[PDB]
């Protein structure tokens, strides 16, 4: 039957040979070779060594460069903090547990690690949505006589916190649950076992619709409007070479952002949708890690796209890293 059930876990390995152990008690070297756990640790190490400096530096240059402290940049800082929740809530813990071959922190740690890693990922996600909305409002100007200020920026950040809690908190109180996933060294939402006692099915649907489809629709609408607005402005002002450059660059960035978003969440959405549609099927531990791979690595390529490729942040970072040199 391809799996072994337990009170707070599901090991994706059959116990017909009697070798399966609780992922909170003993190494899982029967569902993956030791060297594969080492490569899990290696990748977590890579994500920490890249993810922490780039995201911490985002916060650090904002402290040193006052021009960065603008309301429109608040949500970018929110992103940086969210990624750091992924780095220390998830990546460092998984580095430690993978080197043991199982989740040594037990069920309590599983909820802790699961909550903060999910919280971090969801704040980042809704930050990308809020950013699109703010950019849409500012550039396309759907409202007359409106000026985006500090108060609007604070609401936007608070909104991401609330939406993220709307996803991360329910598994702590009975709607779905946190259990070890894949190689059983990191914990996450149970979107793949039919656990009616916590009503997993309805939560996965809620996730898919509210925390994937809706963000996708909003980001597409907002950045679609933005591209149209800039395309239209350039068309009505072809004598301006700069406006033509702007249109090219904005279109390029919008494509990069849209593609990066899909790369991050489509695997999870795809796998969840498949398991939902095809319930009663075998899913390997390495297979479950694939959507996690794409989603977690966003802690590195999102700040590259949203901070490093941002001219204001990039210049300030270069100045800071090169000791005052422009």
């Amino acid at each position: 039957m391809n799996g072994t059930e337990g009170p707070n876990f599901y090991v994706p390995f059959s116990n017909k040979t009697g070798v399966v152990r609780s992922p909170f008690e003993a190494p899982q070297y029967y569902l993956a070779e030791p060297w594969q756990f080492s490569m899990l640790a290696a990748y977590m190490f890579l994500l920490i060594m890249l993810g922490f400096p780039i995201n911490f530096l985002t916060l650090y240059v904002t402290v040193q460069h006052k021009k960065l402290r603008t309301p429109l940049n608040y949500i970018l800082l929110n992103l940086a903090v969210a990624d750091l929740f992924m780095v220390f809530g998830g990546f460092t813990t998984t580095l430690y547990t993978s080197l043991h071959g199982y989740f040594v922190f037990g069920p309590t740690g599983c909820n802790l690690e699961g909550f903060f890693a999910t919280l971090g990922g969801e704040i980042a996600l809704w930050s990308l949505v809020v950013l699109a909305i703010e950019r849409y409002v500012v550039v396309c100007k759907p409202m007359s006589n409106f000026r985006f200020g500090e108060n609007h920026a604070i609401m936007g950040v608070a909104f991401t916190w609330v939406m993220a809690l709307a996803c991360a908190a329910p598994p702590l109180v009975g709607w779905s649950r946190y259990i070890p996933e894949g190689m059983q060294c990191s914990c996450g939402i149970d979107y793949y076992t039919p656990h009616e006692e916590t009503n997993n099915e309805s939560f996965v649907i809620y996730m898919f619709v509210v925390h994937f489809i809706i963000p996708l629709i909003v980001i597409f609408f907002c950045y679609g409007q933005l591209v149209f607005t800039v395309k239209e402005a350039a068309a009505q002002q072809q004598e301006s070479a700069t406006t033509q450059k702007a249109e090219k660059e904005v279109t390029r960035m919008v494509i990069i952002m849209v593609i990066a978003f899909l790369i991050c969440w489509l695997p999870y959405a795809g796998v969840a949708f498949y398991i939902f549609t095809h319930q009663g099927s075998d899913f390997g531990p390495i297979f479950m890690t694939i959507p996690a791979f794409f989603a977690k690595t966003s802690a590195v390529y999102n700040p590259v796209i949203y901070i490093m490729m941002n001219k204001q942040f990039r210049n300030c970072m270069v100045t800071t890293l090169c000791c005052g040199k422009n």
């Binding site: 429109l72 550039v139 607005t229 800039v230 406006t243 702007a246």
Partner: peptide, 11 residues
Amino acid sequence: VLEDLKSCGLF
């Protein structure tokens, strides 16, 4: 439209 784009870090 350029100043709004610059304000958003888009250009």
